[PDB]
């Protein structure tokens, strides 16, 4: 429900086909929150303030 | 006595049962009603 | 039967001309202020926001369904008429 | 066969079906068996009575029953489809259905059936070209004790062997219903080595009353 | 106590083995309709007083304390009538006990409709009987006709003011229709689909009226327990489990029988006193099944130490159903057996609940894949795990009864499956 | 005054008698799942998906049917009531045909979501499915019954709102299969509402077969014409064209559902 299944796992099984049909249409409904991932790109503190 | 005494059910037929339900529609008493002729 | 896409107070606007592109078939427009949802949490917060920006509101009130007495046993009544069939 | 209809010329809602006069006089006792309302409770026996008049209930009997009881026709199709004792394809005349749950299989109710397909030449569900027999692999039939079993439309032959059928079906094809009951000696379901439980002249009326 | 003899004086199932004339004039000799006039007039609460004090629990696959069950409708005027229903549907593979009580003593089964009828308070009783049990039912209406013709039923029940009739409804070949409610819905002329349980049948049941669905035994013993006992019946059997029982024996045994020893007897005796030892001795007797089908195995590690109570077999991780003993031996295919028990339920599930349309048929396809051995072993700790997805997630106790046989097969006989996972895996 | 102290994870909801466990948990904002239950159709436990552990009883209970008794505490997000949902959806998604990119109810599936919300991630099903023989109910309703889940939300419609009694259940086990035993045409007013009421996309709309997909749409709330009821509607568009005409719930007008002329 956060990372879609294998492209062959969604042709034997059902659920893998459903989650495939939702991950790549809607998404996966993160909860509400907020972060600051500061990452050292070669320039520096590459930041992302998700909300 | 060492002899089975329920052999009469050998010579029964398809209508044996319901013919007795018919004979037992005379001894019986009238049945209730919901008021409705049926639940429609 | 999902009723969580309710519970907000979106402020959609009127629709306008959507002409089919002569080249291609695409629906094209000139009014950008058409795909314009804005989610709120209360009616008192919405009219205070559209009066502000000069827009003209038109409210339609909430529609909650009734609570309804639902017994599994009324399907199995002697007198009543809810006596179901197909179990 | 398939829980669905395909309106053949012999299975259409214009076939001749109509109860005999005495049967109409017999459906009424079945509806006086159940209260004034809820006369739709008779859909089970009445729909057997159709099957007894003639086996293999056609579509015209699954409707006519509704017409006799004023029930919706669909509530009649839900019944026959749900139950196994009702037939919906044409059958033969004797309907030799065999138990194959464990305590009958466990006592080799496959040999009673493997020595049956050879005496007949009919796989299971299909029939003779003469159309007298329908082998069926049915689940359980109550008298699980009496070890293997068959059922000739109404009767119970039980605790029998492969050699016991060979006088039976030879007496079905050009004879009578050959003495329903358990073979091998036991009368009904006795211990087949002489009695072990009662062996005595059962007590009389009022034995042991607690001062009522 | 090492009970288990039960001198034949105390047999509450005389005529069972066929002789002494099931008809009236032959059931009158054995004692029936004897003092039934004053059994009634002494009170409904008195009868239940001699069902509670007797410890008569259920006799189907449930084993509920009776007296409490019939007291669920001892009510004042509700307005509707009050009915009784009787599960003569035998059903399970092993339960021939009622194929021998309908005939060979029908009048006992007709009593309890009338004795138990006033006990709960009723207008009539419906003896739902199986579709294949035809000759059984003809023996009833021949006995019920004699009952009316003798003045025992109909507007003056044994010469009293209690109006009553006994009706015989006829099934059409199912096992779920013996359940407490599909019974009731099948009588109503519908699909045999059970009900949910805030509308208990004692408040809204057959034809919208309240009911008490009994077992054939549970009523056949009602007349000759209230005139003949109530505390007598308690002394036999243990405290909570007190009575007799139509034990019923079948499969890999020299003389398979129907016998009613005193209840709760050690199971060692029922294949040695009656129904002489299993074919081969005691290296054999692998996989006994105390109940009919809806009860797990007992692998001979326990079978000598068994006590056939309702609540003692709980400690053996089993239960007593209808007391329909099946016995296997060491020379079998135990998976082939239980694979049919699930095939028995795939052909029989009414198709209503979600984890029984396709939980039973889900397991049919797996155990069938264990017979050949064309599974691997890591399903076995799942096939269990699915079996507990069904237990409390179904209307009727079939999903219970369709997982329990399988849990009995893994709890003990795990490596025999593992053996077959390998034999197949030896191929290539 | 005919009220019952009922608890929901410790809340203190007061409800009238004869209420169901759902109705006790809708006053809090807990939408217990459902396939068999429609708020305006009779009750029948056929999905067995609305289960909740009822606080110190051992057995979960079908919340659609149970009247709450007194002082019970429903635990809707317990470790148990999630095993009672991840194990049900295991079954509904076992004999089910992976036709989601065919199923016209792609984003309009109450069985994809509940799987994607409360069900599991993986199939331990590796056996083999079943397929059902499709019907020809008519030019409005397009049966693909390989995917029906036997919730009886279409017979309880054709017997309590339309008064028809045609779409029975024929058989037992998995071999049971909804629909007429015979070839019949369910052509009545209020025959297009079995589409909206079947949560599965087994029977859906034949004209609106494959013209769109629900996230693609834009939904404008307007009114019916052409009958004098003034029934309420959701006209759904796709880039300056019309693709469906759905209903709105409004209590005085129809109740929740529309005729076949105006859709
Ligand atoms: C699927 C299923 C099938 C059943 N079939 C029978 C049956 O065929 N005969 C029977 O006596 N009880 C059957 N039962 C058990 C009944 O509930 C029981 O007989 C009835 O409740 C009598 O209760 P008692 O023990 O108090 O007399 C069945 C239960 C289930 C779940
Ligand atoms: S468990 Fe099976 S047999 Fe029992 S009611 Fe549910 S679907 Fe029917
Ligand atoms: S109902 Fe349709 S969309 Fe939903 S899971 Fe089934 S096939 Fe997919
Ligand atoms: S067709 Fe739809 S509404 Fe009808 S039983 Fe199947 S899933 Fe339920
Ligand atoms: S198992 Fe064969 S008759 Fe019951
Ligand atoms: S949603 Fe409650 S039983 Fe189906």
Domain positions in chain E:
1-55, 56-235, 236-332, 333-428
| Dist CA E69 CA E120 (whole Å) | 9
In chain E, residues with a C-beta closer than 8 Å to the C-beta of F84 are 393
- Name the phi and psi angles at E71, rounded to 5: -70, -10
Nearest-atom number in ligand 1 for the CA of E92 is 8
Question: Is E277's Cβ below 8 Å from some Cβ in F?
Answer: no
Q: Let me know: does C48 contact E152? Beta carbons within 8 Å.
A: no
CA angle centred on D51, ends D48 and D54, rounded to 5°: 155
CA atoms within 13 A on the CB side of E19: 13
Structure tokens at D202: 């059962």
Provide the 3-class DSSP secondary structure of residue F150.
Answer: coil
Per residue, what are the HEC states of chain E? CCCCCCCHHHCCCCCCCCCCCCCCCCCCCCCCCCCHHHHHHCCHHHHHHHHHCCCCECCCCCCCECCCCHHHHCCCCCCCCCEEEEECCCCCCCCHHHCCCCCCCHHHHHHHHHHHHHHHCCCEEECCECCCCCHHHHHHHHHHHHHHHCCCCCCCCCCCCCCCEEECCECCCCCHHHCCCHHHHHHCCCCCCCCCCCCCCCCCCHHHCCCCEEEHHHHHCCHHHHCCCCCHHHHCCCCCCCCECCEEEECCCCCCCEECCECCCCHHHHCCCCCCCCCCCCCCCCCEECCCCCCCCECCCCHHHCCCCCCHHHHCCCCCCCCEEEECCCCCCHHHHHHHHHHHHHCCCCCCCHHHHCCHHHHHHHHHHHHCCCCCHHHHHHHHHHHCCCCCCCCCCHHHHHHHHHHHHHHCCHHHHHHHHHHHHHCC
Output DSSP code: residue C21: P
| Dist CA C8 CA C41 (whole Å) | 5
Output DSSP code: residue F237: E
Structure tokens at D147: 């070890």
Name the nearest CA neighbour of D142 among E94, E255, E342, E170: E94
Q: What is the DSSP string of D113-134?
A: HHHHHHHH---SSSB-SS---B
Question: How many Cβ atoms are within 10 Å of F21's Cβ, its own excluded?
Answer: 27
Please, which residues have CB within 8 angstroms of residue E420's CB and are 6 or more apart in sequence? E335, E370, E371, E372, E373
Q: Does C contact E via 3+ CB–CB distances below 8 Å?
A: yes
| C19-20 and C27-28 strand pairing | antiparallel
Question: How many Cβ atoms are within 10 Å of A12's Cβ, its own excluded?
Answer: 13
Q: Does C contact D via 3+ CB–CB distances below 8 Å?
A: yes
Structure tokens at F6: 């009922």
Q: Let me know: does E119 contact E70? Beta carbons within 8 Å.
A: yes
Q: Is F50 annotated as a binding residue?
A: yes
Resolution in A: 3.3
In angstroms, the separation between the Cα of residue E195 and the nearest Cα of chain F is 8
Provide the 3-class DSSP secondary structure of residue F249.
Answer: coil
- Name the phi and psi angles at D104, rounded to 5: -95, -40
Name the nearest CA neighbour of E270 among E286, E283, E258, E287: E258
Nearest-atom number in ligand 6 for the CA of F50 is 2
Question: Tokens 């929150």 map to which residue?
Answer: A33
Name the nearest CA neighbour of C72 among E207, F155, F41: F41
Question: Is B12's Cβ below 8 Å from some Cβ in E?
Answer: yes
Interface of B with D in 10-39 (CB under 8 A): 10, 12, 14-15, 18-19, 21-22, 24-25, 28, 31-39
Q: Let me know: does F61 contact F173? Beta carbons within 8 Å.
A: no
Q: Let me know: does F162 contact F41? Beta carbons within 8 Å.
A: no
Name the nearest CA neighbour of D7 among C85, F136, F177: F136
| Dist CA C58 CA C47 (whole Å) | 9
Question: Tokens 């396939």 map to which residue?
Answer: F35
| Dist CA F204 CA F218 (whole Å) | 20
Question: Tokens 């009656």 map to which residue?
Answer: E274
Q: What is the CATH number of domain E333-428?
A: 1.20.1440.230
CA atoms within 13 A on the CB side of E342: 32
Query: What CATH class does E236-332 carry?
Result: alpha beta
| E324-327 and E247-250 strand pairing | parallel
Q: Let me know: does E387 contact F87? Beta carbons within 8 Å.
A: no
Find, in chain D, the residue whose alpha carbon is nearest to that of B13: D154
Helices (H) and strands (E) in chain F, counts: 4, 12
Please, which residues have CB within 8 angstroms of residue D183's CB and are 6 or more apart in sequence? D157, D158, D159, D160, D161, D164
| E124-126 and A39-40 strand pairing | unpaired
Measured by CA distance, the residue closest to atom 3 of ligand 6 is: F45
| Dist CA E37 CA E34 (whole Å) | 8
Which neighbouring-strand residues pair with D157? D150, D181
Terminus-to-terminus CA distance in chain C, angstroms? 23
Question: Does ligand 2 have an atom closer than 6 angstroms to the CB of E353?
Answer: yes
- Helices E398-411, E334-346: axis angle to 10 degrees equals 170
| Dist CA E123 CA E127 (whole Å) | 14
Structure tokens at A27: 């998404």
Question: Exposure of E111 by Cβ count < 10 A (0-12 exposed, 13-18 middle, 19+ buried)?
Answer: buried
- F35 Cα to the center of ligand 6, angstroms: 6
The domain locations on chain C are: 1-87
Pocket test for ligand 5, best of E89, E90, E93 (most atoms within 8 A of CB): E93
Q: Let me know: does E269 contact E344? Beta carbons within 8 Å.
A: no
CA angle centred on E173, ends E171 and E179, rounded to 5°: 70
| Dist CA F135 CA E383 (whole Å) | 35
Name the nearest CA neighbour of E101 among E213, E225, E245: E245
Positive or negative torsion for Cα E370, E374, E377, E378: negative
- Helices D73-82, D43-53: axis angle to 10 degrees equals 70
In which region does residue C26 sit, left (phi positive, over 0), alpha (psi from -120 to 50) or beta (all else)? beta
Provide the 3-class DSSP secondary structure of residue C20.
Answer: strand
| Dist CA E277 CA E285 (whole Å) | 9
- Helices E360-371, E414-426: axis angle to 10 degrees equals 60
Q: Let me know: does D135 contact D122? Beta carbons within 8 Å.
A: yes
Please, which residues have CB within 8 angstroms of residue F222's CB and are 6 or more apart in sequence? F233, F234, F235
- Helices D59-69, D73-82: axis angle to 10 degrees equals 130
| Dist CA F50 CA F34 (whole Å) | 6
Query: For the domain E56-235, what is the CATH superfamily, name and number?
Result: NADH-ubiquinone oxidoreductase 51kDa subunit (3.40.50.11540)
Task: Give the method of determination.
Answer: cryo-EM
């Amino acid at each position: 429900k956060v990372s879609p299944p294998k492209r062959a796992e969604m042709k034997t099984s059902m659920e893998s086909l459903i989650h495939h049909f939702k991950l790549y249409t809607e998404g996966y409904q993160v909860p509400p929150g907020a972060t600051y991932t500061a990452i050292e790109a070669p320039k520096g503190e590459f930041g992302v303030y998700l909300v | 006595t060492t002899t089975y005494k329920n052999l009469q059910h050998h010579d029964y037929n398809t209508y044996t049962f319901l013919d007795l339900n018919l004979d037992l529609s005379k001894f019986r008493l009238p049945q209730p009603s919901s008021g409705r002729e049926s639940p429609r | 039967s999902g009723v969580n896409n309710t519970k907000k107070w979106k402020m959609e606007f009127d629709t306008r001309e959507r002409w089919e592109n002569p080249l291609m078939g695409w629906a094209s427009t000139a009014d950008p202020l058409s795909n314009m949802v804005l989610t709120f949490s209360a009616k008192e917060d919405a009219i205070a926001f559209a009066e502000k920006n000069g827009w003209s509101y038109d409210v339609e009130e909430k529609k909650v369904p009734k609570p309804k007495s639902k017994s599994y046993g009324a399907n199995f009544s002697w007198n009543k008429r809810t006596r179901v069939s197909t179990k | 066969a398939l829980f669905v209809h395909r309106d053949t010329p012999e299975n259409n809602p214009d076939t001749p079906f109509d109860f005999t006069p005495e049967n109409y006089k017999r459906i009424e006792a079945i509806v006086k068996n159940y209260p004034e309302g809820h006369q739709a409770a008779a859909v089970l026996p009445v729909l057997d009575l159709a099957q007894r008049q003639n086996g293999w209930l056609p579509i015209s009997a699954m409707n006519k029953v509704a017409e006799v009881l004023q029930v919706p026709p669909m509530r009649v199709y839900e019944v026959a489809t749900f139950y196994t004792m009702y037939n919906r394809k044409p059958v033969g005349k004797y309907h030799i259905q065999v138990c194959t749950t464990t305590p009958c299989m466990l006592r080799d109710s496959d040999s009673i059936l493997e020595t049956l397909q050879r005496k007949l030449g009919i796989k299971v569900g299909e029939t003779t070209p003469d159309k007298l027999f329908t082998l069926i692999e049915v689940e359980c039939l109550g008298a699980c004790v009496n070890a293997p079993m068959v059922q000739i439309n109404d009767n119970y032959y039980e605790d029998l062997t492969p050699k016991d059928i060979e006088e039976i079906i030879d007496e079905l094809k050009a004879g009578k219903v050959p003495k329903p009951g358990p073979r091998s000696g036991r009368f009904c379901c006795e211990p087949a080595g002489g009695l072990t439980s009662l062996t005595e002249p059962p007590k009389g009326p009022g034995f042991g009353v607690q001062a009522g | 106590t090492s009970f288990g003899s039960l001198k034949d004086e105390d047999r509450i199932f005389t005529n069972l083995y066929g002789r002494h004339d099931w008809r009236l004039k032959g059931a009158l000799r054995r004692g029936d309709w004897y003092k039934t006039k004053e059994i009634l007039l002494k009170g409904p609460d008195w009868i239940l007083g001699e069902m509670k004090t007797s410890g008569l629990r259920g006799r189907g696959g449930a084993g509920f304390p009776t007296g409490l069950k019939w007291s669920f409708m001892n009510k004042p005027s509700d307005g509707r009538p009050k009915y009784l229903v009787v599960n003569a549907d035998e059903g399970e593979p092993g339960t021939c006990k009622d194929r021998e009580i309908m005939r060979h003593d029908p009048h006992k089964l007709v009593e309890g409709c009338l004795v138990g009828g006033r006990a709960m308070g009723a207008r009539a009783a419906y003896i739902y009987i199986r579709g294949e049990f035809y000759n059984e039912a003809s023996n009833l209406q021949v006995a019920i006709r004699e009952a009316y013709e003798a003045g025992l039923i109909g507007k003056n029940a044994c010469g009293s003011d209690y109006d009553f009739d006994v009706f015989v409804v006829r099934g059409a070949g199912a096992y779920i229709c013996g359940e407490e409610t599909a019974l009731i819905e099948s009588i109503e002329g519908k699909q045999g689909k059970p009900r949910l349980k805030p509308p208990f049948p004692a408040d809204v049941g057959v034809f919208g009226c309240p009911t008490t669905v009994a077992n054939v035994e549970t009523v056949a013993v009602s007349p000759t327990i209230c005139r003949r006992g109530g505390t007598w019946f308690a002394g036999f059997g243990r405290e909570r489990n007190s009575g007799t029982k139509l034990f019923n024996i079948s499969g890999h045994v020299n003389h398979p029988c129907t016998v009613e020893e005193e209840m709760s007897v050690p199971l060692k005796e029922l294949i040695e006193k009656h129904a002489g030892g299993v074919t081969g001795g005691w290296d054999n007797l692998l996989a006994v099944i105390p109940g009919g089908s809806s009860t797990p195995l007992i692998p001979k590690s326990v079978c000598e130490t068994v006590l056939m109570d309702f609540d003692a077999l709980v400690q053996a991780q089993t239960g007593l159903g209808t007391a329909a003993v099946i016995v296997m031996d060491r020379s079998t295919d135990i998976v082939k057996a239980i694979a049919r028990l699930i095939e028995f339920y795939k052909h029989e599930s009414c198709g209503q609940c979600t984890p029984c349309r396709e939980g039973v048929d889900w397991m049919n396809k797996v155990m069938a894949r264990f017979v050949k051995g064309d599974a691997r072993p890591a399903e076995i700790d799942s096939l269990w795990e699915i079996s507990k997805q069904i237990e409390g997630h179904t209307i009727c106790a079939l999903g219970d009864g369709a997982a329990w046989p399988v849990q009995g097969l893994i709890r003990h006989f795990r490596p025999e499956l593992e053996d077959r996972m390998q034999r197949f895996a030896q191929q290539h | 005054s005919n009220l019952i102290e009922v608890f929901v994870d410790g809340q203190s909801v007061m409800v009238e008698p004869g209420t169901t466990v759902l109705q006790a948990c809708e006053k809090v904002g807990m939408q217990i799942p459902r396939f068999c239950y429609h708020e305006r159709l009779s009750v029948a436990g056929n999905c067995r998906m609305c289960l909740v552990e009822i606080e110190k009883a051992p057995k979960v209970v079908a919340a659609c049917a149970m009247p709450v008794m007194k002082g019970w505490n429903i635990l809707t997000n317990s470790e148990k009531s999630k095993k009672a949902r991840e194990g049900v959806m295991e079954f509904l998604l076992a004999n089910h045909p992976l036709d989601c990119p065919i199923c016209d109810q792609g984003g309009e599936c109450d069985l994809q979501d509940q799987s994607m919300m409360f069900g599991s991630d993986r199939s331990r099903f590796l056996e083999g499915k079943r397929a059902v023989e499709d019907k020809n109910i008519g030019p409005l309703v397009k049966t693909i019954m390989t995917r029906c889940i036997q919730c009886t939300r279409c017979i309880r419609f054709a017997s309590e709102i339309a008064g028809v009694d045609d779409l029975g259940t024929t058989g037992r086990g998995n071999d049971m299969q909804v629909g007429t035993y015979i070839e019949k045409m369910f052509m009545s007013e209020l025959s297009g509402n079995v589409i909206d009421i079947c949560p599965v996309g087994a029977l859906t709309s034949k004209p609106y077969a494959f013209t769109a997909r629900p996230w693609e749409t834009r939904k404008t709330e307007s009114i019916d014409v052409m009958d004098a009821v003034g029934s309420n509607i959701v006209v759904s568009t796709r880039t300056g064209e019309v693709m469906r005409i759905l209903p709105r719930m409004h209590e005085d007008i129809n109740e929740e559902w529309i005729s076949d002329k105006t859709r």
